[PDB]
Symmetry: C2
Subunit: 92 residues, 2 copies
């Protein structure tokens, strides 16, 4: 039950089309903000809040290389959950 | 994006402590209602609605053996997602 509350909170963070899309893109490796926002249809202000939410939840981290910001998955539990989601829902 | 909407709807069904607990119990194999409701702390009326929701979402099915009702996972995508959730959140 305690593990269920923790897992349910992760799934609430992931149960959002925009946040899930970001996580699916990061599931294949580190991505710059430029790449993410080019790939995503989301307006930039929305992507910005979504990235901040995933950061708050401990699911993504970021680093700087010059003027480029690179996000990557941090939480290994969420990484595997999202990888499973991505693979399962892309397999028809 | 289309796969994201579908996946997000699954995660919304799973992002609920009670429904997730049911799914985690079914992730290890078919279970009678008696076993589920014995293991779960949930009041029976709540479990009943939760089972009906998981059925509506196509995630569980059930069969009868005499007077026993056995539920099992039906959707293979959700099965693997839940198995990943269960394993990841039980591994500390």
């Amino acid at each position: 039950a305690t593990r269920a509350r923790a897992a349910s909170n992760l799934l609430k963070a992931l149960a959002h089309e925009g946040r899930l899309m970001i996580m699916c893109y990061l599931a294949s490796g580190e991505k710059s903000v430029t790449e993410l926002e080019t790939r995503l249809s989301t307006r930039q202000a929305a992507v910005s809040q979504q990235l901040a939410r995933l950061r708050l939840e401990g699911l993504v981290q970021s680093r700087r290389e010059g003027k480029t910001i690179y996000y990557s998955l941090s939480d290994p539990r969420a990484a595997r959950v999202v990888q499973t989601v991505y693979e399962q829902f892309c397999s028809g």
